[PDB]
Design a protein around this ligand. Sequence first.
Ligand SMILES: COc1ccccc1CC(=O)N1CC[C@@H](NC(N)=O)C1
Ligand SMILES: [Zn+2]
Length: 140
Amino acid sequence: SGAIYVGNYRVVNRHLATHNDWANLVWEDSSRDLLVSSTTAQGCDTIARCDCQTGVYYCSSRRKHYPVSFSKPSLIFVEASEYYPARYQSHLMLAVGHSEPGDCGGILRCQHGVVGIVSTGGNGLVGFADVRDLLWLDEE
Ligand SMILES: COc1ccccc1CC(=O)N1CC[C@@H](NC(N)=O)C1
Ligand SMILES: [Zn+2]
């Protein structure tokens, strides 16, 4: 589990969105595993606007933050899970790092701010849904 709180937005994995998220929906995209809902309180996270390929992510199954090198956002085939059939996911970045299904939502960050959230993984890989192209998260 986990979310990014930026401005009056909450960014979560689409597959973990709550009824309150759907009833306060701003934007969602199944092909990216992302959903954004509105919030009453202002958040403290800032979004990175950069091309970093190194950062640090939070892994709940280890209660630890790990440094990682990650690929550029791409279209990658993701295996079937309890939440999606096997399909192509867009804007996904892969890295070598531990992950388990419930690690989705952990933040990946660089020196510039939040880069994305854990979305996929297995066998010593972890995949992150990028958010750096969503420029509208920084305004209104
Ligand atoms: C972090 O995911 C894993 C880690 C280790 C093993 C297996 C997984 C995959 C998994 O169970 N998934 C459930 C949510 C689905 N998200 C998506 N964007 O398709 C991925
Ligand atoms: Zn950066």
